[PDB]
Amino acid sequence: ELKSKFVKVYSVLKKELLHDSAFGLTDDSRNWVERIMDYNVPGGKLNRGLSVVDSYKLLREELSDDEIFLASVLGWSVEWIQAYFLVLDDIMDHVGMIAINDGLILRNHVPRILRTHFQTEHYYLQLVDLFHEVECQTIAGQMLDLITTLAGEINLSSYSLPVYQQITLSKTSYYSFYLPVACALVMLGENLESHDDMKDILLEMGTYFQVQDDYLDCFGDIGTDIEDNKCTWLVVQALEHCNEEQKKLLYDNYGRKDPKQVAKVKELYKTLNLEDLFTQYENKTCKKLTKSIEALPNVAVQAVLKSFLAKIHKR
Amino acid sequence: MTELKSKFVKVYSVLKKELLHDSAFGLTDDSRNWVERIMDYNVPGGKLNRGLSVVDSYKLLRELTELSDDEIFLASVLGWSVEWIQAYFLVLDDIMDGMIAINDGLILRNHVPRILRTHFQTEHYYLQLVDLFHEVECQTIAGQMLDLITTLAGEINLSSYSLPVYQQITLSKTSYYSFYLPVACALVMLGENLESHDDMKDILLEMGTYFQVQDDYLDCFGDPEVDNKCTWLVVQALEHCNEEQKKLLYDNYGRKDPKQVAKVKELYKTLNLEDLFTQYENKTCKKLTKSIEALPNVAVQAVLKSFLAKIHKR
């Protein structure tokens, strides 16, 4: 039902944007723009764009077709903004830097949609500031990622828990966990500025998911983080949790594409019991997050947050 | 007016320290200096033509229509916002001719609405400022996309180079942020609604096209510092030449060889495109002055005449 309705909203928004006569498009440029849309936006699983509509339905307690359409419009706006973010991620992870311009086209589609479908609403400026906040912090996250990565070129003393956490927060969690639920609440008439507790919980949830992926990379059926000199949660823990010759071991073997040295790092990890440290982190995190979800007065917000936390647990 | 400029220049420091210490963004000491250096490189360097012209157009509109220090500060804030947005645009322009330049540029882009929000959210014209900068950015990047399609990717069959394509690129790529944005900022600050100024907008846009044609000519005939470019010169040469001259142009254009370059230059000279450019300049200043005077509002006329005079013959 939602599956079949949501996806048509992509076509609706696409044909709106292509035939917004504000810019003079020829046949050729129109096809250029349509291709750079259809490549990036409508492809994937549509996790977050759908989760906008799903969180909206969850909050509701009866849905009109207009309500569903607008929730879908917000969802697709999320998909667009994420397309922009992911094009930049492509560019930043290993005869055409068209990729920049393509990405920048998609970014500038986001407020055209928001303006076309929500200007009359009384929460228009709140949506604009939401997407603005999310974009500012996503790109600030990318900037932290650059500096940390570059500056951890050999000097692994750059890799600290605060740096890891700020990167995970601003780069991903914001557009990944806050943005869709925030979209739903703003449509629901709420003011986000009286939801700092929910915001913080979703942000910690994003940090949680990143720590998960960091561990899964190193322990699961292949992950290449220790080869790639990445700032994993595992290496950040290993740094301050090891002695002096273990620091020498890590400094020797980290960032090395050689399964011998990779295995040296893996077995320093195992001898430091970072699998059990991760199990403890997971348990304490799910407890803190479930506990502080229940602390929230609103029960439906709790339902949405518990949905998310359950979906990502033990993944 | 170097007495009154020094106030503008301090607003850069004010906005910079605001943005750097927005603890909403989690910045370490380290990242804080990274952001400061990527600001100080791009934004405060140049002559500050457009950022100052925001404040100058505001003063002009006031003087003709007491002028508080807050008014000046806010006009300056808008000016520096223009400087930032232009820095972003110019970083992308550099890029389009290790991969940090993208990230730096995007940091500068996302500073713009932080400033607009910090200093103009309370105002009743906030959404109008946001839509102004949004429109300008959409059309600048659309201009870049047209530039990609037309120039580099529309290579050696130069029959792609037409006056309408040239004009659309010049309009959306540059004219918008270069000539509309600064005066529009001042008018929005003045309480006006831009949607009843389409004539002024169109005039400033044509003015941007004019300035680009100027730069095109200076390139081919001039010194300062420093083929296959979509120049106004080649666009004129195309439809103003016969058939063996078309053969000459197709032979020699896009060719890095001073012999063939000179073949193009002297086809230009035998077509009298220097005199065509002088005529273009005269007819353009006349069309623009005439349609400026057509505007009902006299102070808007004063601002537009200021701009058109500043960019004339130089």
Residue numbers in the entry:
A (entry chain B): 3 to 63, 72 to 104, 120 to 246, 253 to 346
B (entry chain A): 1 to 65, 72 to 103, 121 to 249, 259 to 346
Tell me, in the authors' exact words, what the paper reports.
Specifically, the equivalent positions of residues Cys94 and Ala95 on α4 in EuTPT3 are occupied by Tyr88 and Phe89 in EuFPS1. Therefore, those residues were predicted to be critical for the α5 arrangement and dimeric architecture. To test this hypothesis, we replaced Cys94 and Ala95 in EuTPT3 with tyrosine and phenylalanine, respectively, to create the double mutant EuTPT3(C94Y/A95F). An in vitro test demonstrated that the double mutant lacked the activity for synthesizing ultrahigh molecular weight TPI. Interestingly, we determined the crystal structure of the EuTPT3(C94Y/A95F) mutant protein at 3.3 Å resolution and found that it formed the FPS dimeric conformation. The mutated residues changed the orientation of α5, compared with that in the wild type. The RMSD values of the double mutant subunit compared to the wild-type structures of EuTPT3 and EuFPS1 were 3.41 Å (no. of Cα = 202) and 1.85 Å (no. of Cα = 284), respectively. Thus, the replacement of only two residues switched the dimeric conformation from the TPT-type to the FPS-type dimer. Actually, the replacements of the exact two amino acids in other EuTPTs and their endo product analysis provided reasonable results; mutations of Cys94 and Ala95 in EuFPS1 and Cys96 and Ala96 in EuTPT5 to Tyr and Phe, respectively, resulted in synthesizing FPP, whereas Tyr88 and Phe89 in EuTPT2 (EuFPS1) and Phe95 and Phe96 in EuTPT4 (EuFPS2) produced longer chain length end-product than FPP. These results indicated that Cys94 and Ala95 on α4 in EuTPT3 and the corresponding amino acid in other EuTPTs were essential for the TPT-dimer conformation, which forms the path for newly synthesized ultrahigh molecular weight TPI. Thus, those two residues not only play a key role in determining the product length but also in the formation of the TPT-type dimer.
